[PDB]
Amino acid sequence: FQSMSLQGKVALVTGASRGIGQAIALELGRLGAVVIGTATSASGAEKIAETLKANGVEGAGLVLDVSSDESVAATLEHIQQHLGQPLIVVNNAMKDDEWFDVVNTNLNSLYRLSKAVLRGMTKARWGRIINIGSVVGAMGNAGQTNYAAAKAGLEGFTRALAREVGSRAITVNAVAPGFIDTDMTRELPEAQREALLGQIPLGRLGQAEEIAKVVGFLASDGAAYVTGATVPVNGGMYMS
Amino acid sequence: SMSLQGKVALVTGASRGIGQAIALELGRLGAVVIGTATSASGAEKIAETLKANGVEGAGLVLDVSSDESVAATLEHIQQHLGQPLIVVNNAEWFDVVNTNLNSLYRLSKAVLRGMTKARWGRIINIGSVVNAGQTNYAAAKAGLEGFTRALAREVGSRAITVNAVAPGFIDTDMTRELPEAQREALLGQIPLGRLGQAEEIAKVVGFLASDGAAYVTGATVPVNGGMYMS
Amino acid sequence: LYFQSMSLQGKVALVTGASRGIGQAIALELGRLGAVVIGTATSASGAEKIAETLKANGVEGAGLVLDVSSDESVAATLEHIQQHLGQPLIVVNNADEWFDVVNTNLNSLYRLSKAVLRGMTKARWGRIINIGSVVNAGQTNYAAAKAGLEGFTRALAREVGSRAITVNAVAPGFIDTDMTRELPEAQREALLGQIPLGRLGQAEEIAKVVGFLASDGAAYVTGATVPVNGGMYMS
Amino acid sequence: LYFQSMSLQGKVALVTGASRGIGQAIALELGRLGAVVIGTATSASGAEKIAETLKANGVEGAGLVLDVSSDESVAATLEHIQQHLGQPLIVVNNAMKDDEWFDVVNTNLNSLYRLSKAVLRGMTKARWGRIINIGSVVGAMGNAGQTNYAAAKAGLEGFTRALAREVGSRAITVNAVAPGFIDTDMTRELPEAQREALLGQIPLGRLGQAEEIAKVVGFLASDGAAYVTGATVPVNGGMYMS
Numbered sequence: 034f035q036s037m038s039l040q041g042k043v044a045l046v047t048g049a050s051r052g053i054g055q056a057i058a059l060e061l062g063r064l065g066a067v068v069i070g071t072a073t074s075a076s077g078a079e080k081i082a083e084t085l086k087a088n089g090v091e092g093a094g095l096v097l098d099v100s101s102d103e104s105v106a107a108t109l110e111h112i113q114q115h116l117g118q119p120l121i122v123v124n125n126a127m128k129d130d131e132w133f134d135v136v137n138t139n140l141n142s143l144y145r146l147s148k149a150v151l152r153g154m155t156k157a158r159w160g161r162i163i164n165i166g167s168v169v170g171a172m173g174n175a176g177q178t179n180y181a182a183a184k185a186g187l188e189g190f191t192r193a194l195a196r197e198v199g200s201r202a203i204t205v206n207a208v209a210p211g212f213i214d215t216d217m218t219r220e221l222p223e224a225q226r227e228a229l230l231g232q233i234p235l236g237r238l239g240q241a242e243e244i245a246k247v248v249g250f251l252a253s254d255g256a257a258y259v260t261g262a263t264v265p266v267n268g269g270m271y272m273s
Numbered sequence: 274s275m276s277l278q279g280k281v282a283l284v285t286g287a288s289r290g291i292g293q294a295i296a297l298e299l300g301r302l303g304a305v306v307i308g309t310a311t312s313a314s315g316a317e318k319i320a321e322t323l324k325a326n327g328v329e330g331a332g333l334v335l336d337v338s339s340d341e342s343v344a345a346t347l348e349h350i351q352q353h354l355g356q357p358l359i360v361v362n363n364a365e366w367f368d369v370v371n372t373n374l375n376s377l378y379r380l381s382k383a384v385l386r387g388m389t390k391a392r393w394g395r396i397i398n399i400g401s402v403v404n405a406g407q408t409n410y411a412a413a414k415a416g417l418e419g420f421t422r423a424l425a426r427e428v429g430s431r432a433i434t435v436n437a438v439a440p441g442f443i444d445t446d447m448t449r450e451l452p453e454a455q456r457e458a459l460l461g462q463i464p465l466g467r468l469g470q471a472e473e474i475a476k477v478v479g480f481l482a483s484d485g486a487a488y489v490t491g492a493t494v495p496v497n498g499g500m501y502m503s
Numbered sequence: 504l505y506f507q508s509m510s511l512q513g514k515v516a517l518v519t520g521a522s523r524g525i526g527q528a529i530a531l532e533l534g535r536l537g538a539v540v541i542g543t544a545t546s547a548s549g550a551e552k553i554a555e556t557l558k559a560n561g562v563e564g565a566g567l568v569l570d571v572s573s574d575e576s577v578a579a580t581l582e583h584i585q586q587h588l589g590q591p592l593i594v595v596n597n598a599d600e601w602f603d604v605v606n607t608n609l610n611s612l613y614r615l616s617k618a619v620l621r622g623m624t625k626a627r628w629g630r631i632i633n634i635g636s637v638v639n640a641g642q643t644n645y646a647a648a649k650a651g652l653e654g655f656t657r658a659l660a661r662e663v664g665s666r667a668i669t670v671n672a673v674a675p676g677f678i679d680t681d682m683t684r685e686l687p688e689a690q691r692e693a694l695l696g697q698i699p700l701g702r703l704g705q706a707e708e709i710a711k712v713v714g715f716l717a718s719d720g721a722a723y724v725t726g727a728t729v730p731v732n733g734g735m736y737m738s
Numbered sequence: 739l740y741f742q743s744m745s746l747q748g749k750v751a752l753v754t755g756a757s758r759g760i761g762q763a764i765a766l767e768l769g770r771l772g773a774v775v776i777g778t779a780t781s782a783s784g785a786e787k788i789a790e791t792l793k794a795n796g797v798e799g800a801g802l803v804l805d806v807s808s809d810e811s812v813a814a815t816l817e818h819i820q821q822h823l824g825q826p827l828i829v830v831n832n833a834m835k836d837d838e839w840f841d842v843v844n845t846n847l848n849s850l851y852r853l854s855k856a857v858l859r860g861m862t863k864a865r866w867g868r869i870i871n872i873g874s875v876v877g878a879m880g881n882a883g884q885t886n887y888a889a890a891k892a893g894l895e896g897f898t899r900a901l902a903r904e905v906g907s908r909a910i911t912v913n914a915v916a917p918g919f920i921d922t923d924m925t926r927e928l929p930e931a932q933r934e935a936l937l938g939q940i941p942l943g944r945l946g947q948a949e950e951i952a953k954v955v956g957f958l959a960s961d962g963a964a965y966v967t968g969a970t971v972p973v974n975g976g977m978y979m980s
């Protein structure tokens with residue numbers, strides 16, 4: 034199953050200590066990648082290292098703050114010294130008037146991390162950038178507004194970046210999850226969980242593994258002609 | 274009737290092309306019109322154009338990238354004419370789009386106070402006119418659409434509408450000197466087989482500003498003769 | 504004589520499904536804008552009612568019987584209109600099961616559209632405006648009808664564009680009718696909570712958008728679907 | 739007595755239009771992933787060629803004659819597959835001027851519907867299914883081709899999403915793959931100077947291979963894609979036409 038092998042590649046997965054990010058990190062490791070998972074605390078990083086080890090995945094856990102040029106540059110250097118250039122990068126890391134700052138800040142962080150890893154990918158003439166959107170289920174109209182805004186911004190961003198870097202055989206894609214069984218979602222009020230479930234044609238929540246498998250495919254050689262795409266993974270619930 | 278009499282309209286980037294035609298269309302509908310430019314020369318020209326067409330208002334200097342210029346300009350308008358209740362925003366892909374949306378946000382938030390007091394408003398965002406160019410164009414359009422929809426959601430309960438107009442190939446100063454080969458290829462992609470006039474964008478704007486469009490919000494109306502670039 | 508200074512003076516407009524709600528309001532708006540209006544219904548009773556409504560509002564035109572599913576009724580109604588009033592250059596289409604519904608409706612749009620295109624091609628001018636349906640099983644049907652209508656409208660606009668005919672659609676959200684006014688208080692409040700403007704739309708608010716799309720000012724708008732939904736977007 | 743885990747082994751897949759290009763590559767990819775594959779064509783000649791291609795590649799299955807525009811041919815074909823091999827739980831539907839778009843799209847969607855409804859009964863009883871619709875590749879070069887292409891894609895997206903909704907509660911997914919410019923007969927025979935302008939519209943700077951579509955289909959068919967439904971995955975090297 035050679036079009037699925039990630040053997041020989043180094044993959045950076047931001048926000049990898051739990052839920053979707055962790056499952057992505059294990060799916061890339063299982064496919065044969067060396068995996069570097071990041072968290073914002075030392076506690077998170079150590080826990081990533083442990084989870085990788087317990088699953089036989091070589092790599093590391095480390096601390097990365099995607100909002101800081103310094104942390105990004107420093108982290109990339111660490112990865113280069115110890116393991117080599119990451120050619121697969123997965124970016125995974127409420128009031129009504131706050132949607133603008135959240136989305137703007139997040140896209141600025143995708144941009145900052147994407148640009149820093151592009152140089153290595155340009156040299157290698159090969160790359161995979163995969164952006165993970167946010168999980169559904171924020172409270173109120175404020176939550177639906179923020180959710181729709183983040184998704185539209187992510188789609189346009191992903192498509193433009195794919196265009197900018199395409200000639201270098203780097204693909205850029207996104208995955209837009211729906212209602213997925215995670216820490217955040219299990220702790221939602223039961224009424225809110227039940228109302229969201231009632232809107233899912235498949236009649237169940239997604240597993241974190243079901244996002245990871247899509248990411249694993251996008252990282253593979255078999256997805257080499259897929260770029261600029263946003264793959265929704267939402268059991269048929271399309272929230273606009 | 275569908276008169277804009279008694280309303281004050283601010284149109285940014287109003288010294289030429291699409292912005293100037295929007296300014297005159299709102300004036301023709303009876304609005305008091307404040308048009309902006311980035312130089313004193315632009316502002317003066319706007320004032321002269323308005324006068325020559327019988328439109329009351331003013332030309333002024335506004336830099337949408339500066340909090341200070343925005344706050345100051347609005348203050349001048351408020352002292353002298355009242356709150357603008359109709360605002361039309363007409364003034365490396367990543368930096369361009371990010372900068373522009375941060376500007377829409379900045380201007381939009383400052384004019385929202387006046388609109389919230391009046392319980393009524395119209396915000397209309399004008400997208401940019403039609404590989405590097407296609408990428409930039411598609412990026413600016415996707416960002417504008419999501420932005421317009423989200424802001425509409427945030428201000429809707431206050432009877433303020435927020436909409437966008439996405440122009441295609443329009444006859445302006447930028448487009449008037451494009452090489453013949455590029456013009457011909459573009460025409461071949463336009464079902465109506467011609468460029469749009471600046472007036473044709475202005476009429477869409479004039480309708481979105483009206484009472485009849487009061488249930489239209491969050492929309493991006495494409496005005497492109499049937500040429501859709503994604 | 505008496506000449507309106509409104510945008511549609513001198514034009515003949517056909518509005519299908521005009522005996523109530525959205526269709527009736529579109530018919531009166533086009534009339535108010537100075538068009539001669541032909542409104543259609545599927546029964547003689549509907550047609551007569553349309554005729555009475557138009558007269559009562561000072562609109563010149565007629566109410567007629569049209570079945571958009573029948574080639575014959577279409578061709579025949581068009582001939583009658585051209586003989587008695589002139590060529591209609593403005594046409595507004597307002598007349599588990601989701602597939603049949605959408606497929607049947609798009610086949611009807613195609614049939615009516617093709618028959619009126621000959622008059623519009625001779626005049627080198629036209630407006631075709633398709634009205635989508637008003638808002639689980641209901642959301643699926645609604646999203647399907649809207650996606651089909653959007654792709655259809657854009658493809659037809661491409662096919663006829665070189666003739667200075669525009670083709671556009673209007674996609675309504677929740678509009679105020681008897682069905683909606685009689686919803687229980689809890690259900691109506693939950694509904695309004697999904698609409699940023701916090702209210703239902705009036706039929707007139709759809710009609711004003713149609714009236715604009717029909718005007719000379721909208722000459723460069725084609726292939727578009729203008730949502731009129733108070734900011735509530737479902738797909 | 740072979741009990742599979744997380745694979746297509748033992749699943750029966752029906753691939754319409756499987757005698758050449760995209761369809762054939764899909765049929766071999768599903769075979770390689772362990773499915774029993776039934777590939778269809780509209781002629782006996784096509785069917786025979788499918789049978790031979792499957793055999794030569796070590797895939798179990800069959801080539802058959804199916805006309806997706808005919809209720810009779812559909813019902814009859816499904817009956818034959820049921821009697822001899824079992825219910826197909828994976829089904830892949832793969833089977834100029836501006837003014838032809840309506841007939842093409844209307845005919846094709848009616849056919850997706852007809853085939854999809856007939857296979858749903860088997861999938862409902864199994865509580866498991868995969869329906870994958872393949873869009874059309876860019877067909878000619880100017881306006882007429884772009885119109886037709888964009889129309890077929892918009893129809894396919896809305897159709898896929900609505901059907902996904904209708905059948906979701908039965909653990910059947912419905913998805914689509916929208917190819918761009920793929921290396922085929924239509925593309926190979928075209929003028930050389932026009933090929934360079936075409937590539938200039940594709941950020942990856944090349945045409946896609948049929949295998950690159952087949953791999954996306956193979957993933958959508960798998961257990962790992964169980965929460966993907968209603969989606970249209972574009973496979974176009976970054977060239978988006980609408």
Ligand SMILES: FC(F)(F)c1nc2ccccc2[nH]1
Nearest residue numbers: 136140186370371416419420
């Ligand atoms: F519209 C929006 F979702 F707020 C957004 N912000 C952006 C910032 C940079 C690039 C695209 C963006 N899109």
Ligand SMILES: FC(F)(F)c1nc2ccccc2[nH]1
Nearest residue numbers: 605606609651843844847893
């Ligand atoms: F949903 C549907 F009824 F199948 C349909 N029919 C169509 C015909 C032409 C374009 C889109 C279409 N969508």
